[PDB]
Amino acid sequence: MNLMITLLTNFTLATLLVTIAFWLPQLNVYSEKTSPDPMGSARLPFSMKFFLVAITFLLFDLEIALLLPLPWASQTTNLNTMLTMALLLIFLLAVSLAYEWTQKGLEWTE
Amino acid sequence: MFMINVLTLIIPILLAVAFLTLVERKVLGYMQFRKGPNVVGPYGLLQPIADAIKLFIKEPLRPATSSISMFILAPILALTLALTMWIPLPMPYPLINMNLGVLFMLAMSSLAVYSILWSGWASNSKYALIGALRAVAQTISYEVTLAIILLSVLLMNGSFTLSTLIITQEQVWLIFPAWPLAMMWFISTLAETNRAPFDLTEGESGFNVEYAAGPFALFFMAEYANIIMMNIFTTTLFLGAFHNPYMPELYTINFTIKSLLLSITFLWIRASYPRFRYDQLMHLLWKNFLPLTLALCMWHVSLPILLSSIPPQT
Amino acid sequence: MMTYIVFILSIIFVMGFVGFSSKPSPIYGGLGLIVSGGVGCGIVLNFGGSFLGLMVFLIYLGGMMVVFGYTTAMATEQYNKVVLGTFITGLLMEFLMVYYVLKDKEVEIVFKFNGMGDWVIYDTGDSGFFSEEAMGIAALYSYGTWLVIVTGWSLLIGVVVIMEITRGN
Amino acid sequence: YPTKETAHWKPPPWNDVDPPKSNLTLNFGPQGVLRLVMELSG
Amino acid sequence: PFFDVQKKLGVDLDHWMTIQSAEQPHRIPARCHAFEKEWIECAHGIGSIRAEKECKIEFEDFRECLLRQKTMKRLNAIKRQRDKLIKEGKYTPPPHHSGQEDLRP
Amino acid sequence: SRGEYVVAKLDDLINWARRSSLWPMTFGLACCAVEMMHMAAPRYDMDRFGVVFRASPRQSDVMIVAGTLTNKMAPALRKVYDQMPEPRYVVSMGSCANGGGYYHYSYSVVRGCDRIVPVDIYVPGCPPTAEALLYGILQLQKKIKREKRLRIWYRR
Amino acid sequence: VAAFLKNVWAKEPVLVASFAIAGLAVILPTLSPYTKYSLMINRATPYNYPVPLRDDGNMPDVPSHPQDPQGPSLEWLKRL
Amino acid sequence: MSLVYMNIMMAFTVSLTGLLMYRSHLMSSLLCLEGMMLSLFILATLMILNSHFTLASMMPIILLVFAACEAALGLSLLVMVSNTYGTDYVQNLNLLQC
Amino acid sequence: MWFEVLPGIAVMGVCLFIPGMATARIHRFSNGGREKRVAHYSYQWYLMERDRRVSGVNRYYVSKGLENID
Ligand SMILES: CCCCCCCCCCCCCCCCCC(=O)OC[C@H](COP(=O)([O-])OCC[N+](C)(C)C)OC(=O)CCCCCCCCCCCCCCCCC
Ligand SMILES: CCCCCCCCCCCCCCCCCC(=O)OC[C@H](COP(=O)(O)OCCN)OC(=O)CCCCCCCCCCCCCCCCC
Ligand SMILES: CCCCCCCCCCCCCCCCCC(=O)OC[C@H](COP(=O)(O)OCCN)OC(=O)CCCCCCCCCCCCCCCCC
Ligand SMILES: CCCCCCCCCCCCCCCCCC(=O)OC[C@H](COP(=O)(O)OCCN)OC(=O)CCCCCCCCCCCCCCCCC
Ligand SMILES: CCCCCCCCCCCCCCCCCC(=O)OC[C@H](COP(=O)(O)OCCN)OC(=O)CCCCCCCCCCCCCCCCC
Ligand SMILES: CCCCCCCCCCC1=C(C)C(=O)C(OC)=C(OC)C1=O
Ligand code: SF4
Structure with missing residues (x-):
């Protein structure tokens, strides 16, 4: 209840500030400008490196989503099983990082 | 009555941001053997007011934007996500007490990159788009280590609640058992808010080159609010203060002093070192920070079991 | 009208789905999907699933739709009747369904649905000193050993697969 | 059985390989002073 | 083919999740634990063909616990009659149904 | 009347805001740019006047x-x-920027930058000292102070 | 085997530290004598109600009152 | 039954009809597919939380993880065909008619 | 010299001290001179609602003790 009131207040304060920042020099009548990037009309070059680091981030983010409930899960009675599963998950994280490392995955954006 | 609490939260944030601009200018000046602004007011106390009025009466750029919708929406998101990451902060009592405030903060920080993406796409310049894509990649790549470090630190806390983080450090500071995590967290938050030596957009096009002076000021104000918020979060995580339940002003003064010292350390960092290259910081993250973060995460999972020191769930 | 908050949020959810499913442009579809995901997380939070809604914000929106819009920025170079037509007709079926639901408090399309507010189905008891969803998720390392094993193996294999197919050799 | 619809249908390649159908150029202007023309490959 | 590897080997790979009335953490009960237990104690060992007809009333009770169409319909009818009587003006609501009861504990 | 007083006070406010936050861009062409760098040195400290060091061209x-x-x-x-x-x-x-200077009669030198852009303040010297450029900046601030934009708008 | 460790610790010390911390984390809980204390601290936390048992007549171990001598004890937790 | 269930089914049906009728781009198809997954997430989460099935609370996390890995594979395929043809149009993927 | 950065840091420190002090004072004022009660779990909320129902004022911070029992 109070949370969405605060969210609405922050949103309306931000949109009020943005509206005043936009439309206040609009009331000025300064001039009309014609105005006729270093590249003129070149196509954006598709780079596999940026896509590769994006996908690596996504997969590591998924394994982070798997790792997230560890503080709650440490309160279980089956402590040996939980410890083994946690160590196995972080070991799989390390193994994926090492496979990306060895096969030149982290190359020229190291 | 609650709107008074909301207003007294959000208006001092903007006031502290403007005086952070003044303090950074003056501290950098005195660190570079000179003075900061001292002519506009008594010791430059009137500089943010003059600068704000000048930026709010400046001519707009009026770009040929590909999409005016996200051109509007990017500062909206930046300011809303800068202001909304303060409500679960305990000072020593949070405005919105959240059971999962830490993970709520992580969600908002992960959501913060859409402002960069939409500001890059709205501008017609392709070099601006390339700079925005590089900044987004750096930001998400440091989100990864932020998440792992926060997860490994929270194993000494026992829950995601930010108010329990005061209770955990009632005996000793959390920088004593987790100082490597503290160093890696500090560098990761420094690279998270795009600050030196990681502010690549100022080194040789920014993501908001076509934005007008007003919206540029709004973006910069959101960035400074992010800096103050991150330093307060770091102080709460690692440098917890003594909280008397009958005198909350003691905790308020103590963590205010500590967070101001941490922000001054941010400004101290920004004027000591050269900037990184893009591949150099990618190397620093994926090949230096990440393996040690994983090793320390495994260590801090397996440590409280072998010490019979599992923190209470509630 | 405040008792119908989850229903109103579901209306916003399906309206955003109609908007982004009309396919105006990939970036606008991504924006509509982000808005719809936020409203759906609001639905889950109002139902009591704080952890699952925050997973939606952290992983779906902050971690994955970022990748979708990031790939969308690396294609589909920057600068219709069909989009407006399907948006209008989807809004029409949606509001016709809402009117038929609220006028008679019952409806049947494939299954039978009831037009009362959705606060009726809630449980009248307390959960004690813990939240039920957090314990259910936390039982993954104690009960779901097999689930952890197959999910982690699939994630590692996915890393290997993505590295294999983008190399070109 | 070729029809009118199946008239532009070429056979597949013998090795089943279709042909794959440059680099970025930047003009760093004078904005001492120096102009640079950079042929960049990522 | 359904190779029952788990029963042959004695492992328990997915049986813990497979029903709602199973062993849950912290002994947390579900909303329809009793109905599901009664339906399972019916259907065990008689095959699907006999269990689809023999004690179907247990499955009807379980489905009514799960989805609650009849309870919703009854509440809808009661509220509709109350609304009609209120509008026509021959029913006055009691004090305890208008927020003036000062509840027990 | 009241309106003239209001527009006079508002004009003073906006002129104070504009003249006390002058963000410069510098064309680093020749010797005089080295002297500009020497005015940005600790001794003269262009920053203490509200005049930042090397602002962007899009916001200067x-x-x-x-x-x-x-x-x-x-x-x-x-x-x-x-x-x-x-x-x-x-x-x-x-x-060199004032009228051409040493290379006035050259075949490839524009005889003054006022043939391309409108110029407000002319700082003489070769190179003018950091003191002289600071004086020129402060004279520009004085010129901004006595502007009368809102009074002119009210009278028209 | 011995000079390899010195060379790899002079060249990549970060990876040496990471692998050493990982090895400590994976071999220390199986070696420490305090893991059983974590086990019986986690299993002695009273989340839900201790439902009583109907006295048929033969339960000498089960107490009839909380302050009765028979029953589980947490003096080991109070001392440790 | 309930009403938000009807709205989530209709959202899933809208996203399915969006996927099943391509307009121009492959990215719009991927967006419709992932909206379908999001509707599945919301529906399953609401059912599990209302039914108080404690041990089923782990299912939407596994569903999210597996379908996001699916989406990563699909994005990689889209990037490969965009590198082949210079655009992600669905009318260029017609070599296999012959 | 260096002590002239202190007015700006003091203004920043005041603006950072303001929200926490305001929040603590508002919570103490609005809850009858006590801390705002934390309800993270449904048992604590059930105690909240029971105390609100037993107050007789429909107000959860009006706590009644041994003066109510016979
Ligand atoms: C919040 C509290 C305060 C935090 C600190 C704030 C003040 C200090 C600020 C410093 C300067 C910041 C600006 C520069 C930032 C960028 C540079 C940077 O940080 O680079 C990091 C550098 C980068 O390393 P690098 O790049 O030099 O590494 C060389 C790598 N090759 C050869 C491949 C090029 O270091 C690290 O990443 C280390 C992180 C911390 C490690 C902590 C280890 C703890 C001890 C473990 C045990 C060791 C013993 C052995 C095992 C024993 C087992 C029993
Ligand atoms: C949380 C705390 C936040 C604090 C933020 C602010 C910090 C700095 C506070 C102010 C510091 C001192 C500023 C002094 C300004 C100059 C005052 C002055 O004397 O101005 C004189 C000037 C010309 O006067 P004139 O009559 O022409 O002189 C001839 C007479 N021989 O006359 C004029 O220029 C006209 C009158 C100007 C008056 C200016 C007064 C100060 C304005 C400060 C604005 C912000 C105030 C605080 C807001 C937040 C808290 C409420
Ligand atoms: C209806 C009537 C009202 C109409 C609207 C007007 C509202 C009030 C506007 C401010 C007051 C009007 C006068 C402005 C200044 C005019 C006098 C002046 O020029 O004073 C100069 C003096 C410094 O002298 P200087 O030339 O700089 O000398 C350098 C040293 N050798 O300067 C000084 O000593 C300091 C001057 C400070 C000016 C006031 C403080 C700043 C403005 C505060 C209010 C607006 C902004 C509020 C905050 C916005 C968010 C940041
Ligand atoms: C381009 C579009 C506009 C972009 C700018 C604006 C939107 C983006 C910036 C704002 C983002 C807001 C995020 C809101 C959800 C965050 C999660 C959340 O609510 O967590 C708090 C809490 C869960 O914590 P817990 O302590 O368990 O709850 C109390 C338990 N006793 O949960 C609660 O307390 C639940 C309270 C009831 C449910 C609240 C639902 C809020 C409304 C729906 C989402 C609104 C945002 C939609 C758009 C998303 C972005 C496009
Ligand atoms: C078994 C323990 C638990 C294991 C699971 C948990 C692991 C946690 C840490 C995860 C780390 C993930 C990433 C690992 C990558 C290793 C491979 C690698 O990077 O090899 C290349 C590197 C030489 O570098 P270069 O080829 O030039 O690459 C550019 C950077 N300079 O090559 C090297 O620098 C040499 C690296 C291999 C040798 C390291 C030896 C460390 C020994 C430490 C003491 C013993 C610790 C106990 C465990 C046994 C270790 C053998
Ligand atoms: C509600 C609006 C409050 C005022 C806006 C934020 C404060 C003004 C910031 C201006 C500014 C200052 C002082 C400044 O010094 C600076 O240089 C680092 C900027 O960026 C180029 C700035 O934008
Ligand atoms: S005016 Fe003199 S000092 Fe300045 S650029 Fe010309 S030659 Fe050099």
């Missing part, structure tokens, strides 16, 4: 032309000047 207020404007450089100077948001001001530093 005053543009400083410090050096020789050749024929190969003049269209770039005009293109940079045209992209600046208003209110924009131009300060000419040294003889």
Whole structure:
């Protein structure tokens, strides 16, 4: 209840500030400008490196989503099983990082 | 009555941001053997007011934007996500007490990159788009280590609640058992808010080159609010203060002093070192920070079991 | 009208789905999907699933739709009747369904649905000193050993697969 | 059985390989002073 | 083919999740634990063909616990009659149904 | 009356805001740019007047032309000047930007930067000292202070 | 085997530290004598109600009152 | 039954009809597919939380993880065909008619 | 010299001290001179609602003790 009131207040304060920042020099009548990037009309070059680091981030983010409930899960009675599963998950994280490392995955954006 | 609490939260944030601009200018000046602004007011106390009025009466750029919708929406998101990451902060009592405030903060920080993406796409310049894509990649790549470090630190806390983080450090500071995590967290938050030596957009096009002076000021104000918020979060995580339940002003003064010292350390960092290259910081993250973060995460999972020191769930 | 908050949020959810499913442009579809995901997380939070809604914000929106819009920025170079037509007709079926639901408090399309507010189905008891969803998720390392094993193996294999197919050799 | 619809249908390649159908150029202007023309490959 | 590897080997790979009335953490009960237990104690060992007809009333009770169409319909009818009587003006609501009861504990 | 007093006070406010936050861009062409760097040194401290060090061309207020404007450089100077948001001001530093200076009779030197852009303040010298450029900046601030934009708008 | 460790610790010390911390984390809980204390601290936390048992007549171990001598004890937790 | 269930089914049906009718781009198809997954997430989460099935609370996390890995594979395929043809149009993927 | 950065840091420190002090004072004022009660779990909320129902004022911070029992 109070949370969405605060969210609405922050949103309306931000949109009020943005509206005043936009439309206040609009009331000025300064001039009309014609105005006729270093590249003129070149196509954006598709780079596999940026896509590769994006996908690596996504997969590591998924394994982070798997790792997230560890503080709650440490309160279980089956402590040996939980410890083994946690160590196995972080070991799989390390193994994926090492496979990306060895096969030149982290190359020229190291 | 609650709107008074909301207003007294959000208006001092903007006031502290403007005086952070003044303090950074003056501290950098005195660190570079000179003075900061001292002519506009008594010791430059009137500089943010003059600068704000000048930026709010400046001519707009009026770009040929590909999409005016996200051109509007990017500062909206930046300011809303800068202001909304303060409500679960305990000072020593949070405005919105959240059971999962830490993970709520992580969600908002992960959501913060859409402002960069939409500001890059709205501008017609392709070099601006390339700079925005590089900044987004750096930001998400440091989100990864932020998440792992926060997860490994929270194993000494026992829950995601930010108010329990005061209770955990009632005996000793959390920088004593987790100082490597503290160093890696500090560098990761420094690279998270795009600050030196990681502010690549100022080194040789920014993501908001076509934005007008007003919206540029709004973006910069959101960035400074992010800096103050991150330093307060770091102080709460690692440098917890003594909280008397009958005198909350003691905790308020103590963590205010500590967070101001941490922000001054941010400004101290920004004027000591050269900037990184893009591949150099990618190397620093994926090949230096990440393996040690994983090793320390495994260590801090397996440590409280072998010490019979599992923190209470509630 | 405040008792119908989850229903109103579901209306916003399906309206955003109609908007982004009309396919105006990939970036606008991504924006509509982000808005719809936020409203759906609001639905889950109002139902009591704080952890699952925050997973939606952290992983779906902050971690994955970022990748979708990031790939969308690396294609589909920057600068219709069909989009407006399907948006209008989807809004029409949606509001016709809402009117038929609220006028008679019952409806049947494939299954039978009831037009009362959705606060009726809630449980009248307390959960004690813990939240039920957090314990259910936390039982993954104690009960779901097999689930952890197959999910982690699939994630590692996915890393290997993505590295294999983008190399070109 | 070729029809009118199946008239532009070429056979597949013998090795089943279709042909794959440059680099970025930047003009760093004078904005001492120096102009640079950079042929960049990522 | 359904190779029952788990029963042959004695492992328990997915049986813990497979029903709602199973062993849950912290002994947390579900909303329809009793109905599901009664339906399972019916259907065990008689095959699907006999269990689809023999004690179907247990499955009807379980489905009514799960989805609650009849309870919703009854509440809808009661509220509709109350609304009609209120509008026509021959029913006055009691004090305890208008927020003036000062509840027990 | 009341309206003239209101517009006078508002004019003083906006002139104080504009003159006390002058963000400069500097054209690092020649010797005079080294002297500009020496005015940004700790001794003279351009920053303490509210005048930042090396602001972006897309957000600057005053543009400083410090050096020789050749024929190969003049269209770039005009293109940079045209992209600046208003209110924009131009300060000419040294003889090369004032009238050509040593290379006035050369075949490839524009005889003064006032043939390309409008110029407000002329700073003489070769190079003018850091004291002289600081004096020119403060004189530009004095010129901004006595502007009468809102009074002119009210009277028209 | 011995000079390899010195060379790899002079060249990549970060990876040496990471692998050493990982090895400590994976071999220390199986070696420490305090893991059983974590086990019986986690299993002695009273989340839900201790439902009583109907007294048929033969339960000498089960107490009839909380302050009765028979029953589980947490003196080991109070001392440790 | 309930009403938000009807709205989530209709959202899933809208996203399915969006996927099943391509307009121009492959990215719009991927967006419709992932909206379908999001509707599945919301529906399953609401059912599990209302039914108080404690041990089923782990299912939407596994569903999210597996379908996001699916989406990563699909994005990689889209990037490969965009590198082949210069655009991600669905009318260029017609070599296998012959 | 260096002590002239202190007015700006003091203004920043005041603006950072303001929200926490305001929040603590508002919570103490609005809850009858006590801390705002934390309800993270449904048992604590059930105690909240029971105390609100037993107050007789429909107000959860009006706590009644041994003066109510016979
Ligand atoms: C919040 C509290 C305060 C935090 C600190 C704030 C003040 C200090 C600020 C410093 C300067 C910041 C600006 C520069 C930032 C960028 C540079 C940077 O940080 O680079 C990091 C550098 C980068 O390393 P690098 O790049 O030099 O590494 C060389 C790598 N090759 C050869 C491949 C090029 O270091 C690290 O990443 C280390 C992180 C911390 C490690 C902590 C280890 C703890 C001890 C473990 C045990 C060791 C013993 C052995 C095992 C024993 C087992 C029993
Ligand atoms: C949380 C705390 C935040 C604090 C933020 C602010 C920090 C700095 C506070 C102010 C510091 C001192 C500023 C002094 C300004 C100059 C005052 C002055 O004397 O101005 C004189 C000037 C000309 O006067 P004149 O009559 O022409 O002189 C001839 C007479 N021989 O006359 C004029 O220029 C006209 C009158 C100007 C008056 C200016 C007064 C100060 C304005 C400060 C604005 C912000 C105030 C605080 C807001 C937040 C808290 C409420
Ligand atoms: C209906 C009537 C009202 C109409 C609207 C007007 C509202 C009030 C506007 C401010 C007051 C009007 C006068 C402005 C200044 C005029 C006098 C002046 O020029 O004073 C100069 C003096 C410094 O002298 P200087 O030339 O700089 O000398 C350098 C040292 N050798 O300067 C000084 O000593 C300091 C001057 C400070 C000016 C006031 C403080 C700043 C403005 C505060 C209010 C607006 C902004 C509020 C905050 C916005 C968000 C940041
Ligand atoms: C381009 C579009 C506009 C972009 C700018 C604006 C939107 C983006 C910036 C704002 C983002 C807001 C995020 C809101 C959800 C965050 C999660 C959340 O609510 O967590 C708090 C809490 C869960 O914590 P817990 O302590 O367990 O709850 C109390 C338990 N006793 O949960 C609660 O307390 C639940 C309270 C009831 C449910 C609240 C639902 C809020 C409304 C729906 C989402 C609104 C945002 C939609 C758009 C998303 C972005 C496009
Ligand atoms: C078994 C323990 C638990 C294991 C699971 C948990 C692991 C946690 C840490 C995860 C780390 C993930 C990433 C690992 C990558 C290793 C491979 C690698 O990077 O090899 C290349 C590197 C030489 O570098 P270069 O080829 O030039 O690459 C550019 C950077 N300079 O090559 C090297 O620098 C040499 C690296 C291999 C040798 C390291 C030896 C460390 C020994 C430490 C003491 C013993 C610790 C106990 C465990 C046994 C270790 C053998
Ligand atoms: C509600 C609006 C409050 C005022 C806006 C934020 C404060 C003004 C910031 C201006 C500014 C200052 C002082 C400044 O010094 C600076 O240089 C680092 C900027 O970026 C180029 C700035 O934007
Ligand atoms: S005026 Fe003199 S000092 Fe300045 S650029 Fe010309 S030759 Fe050099």
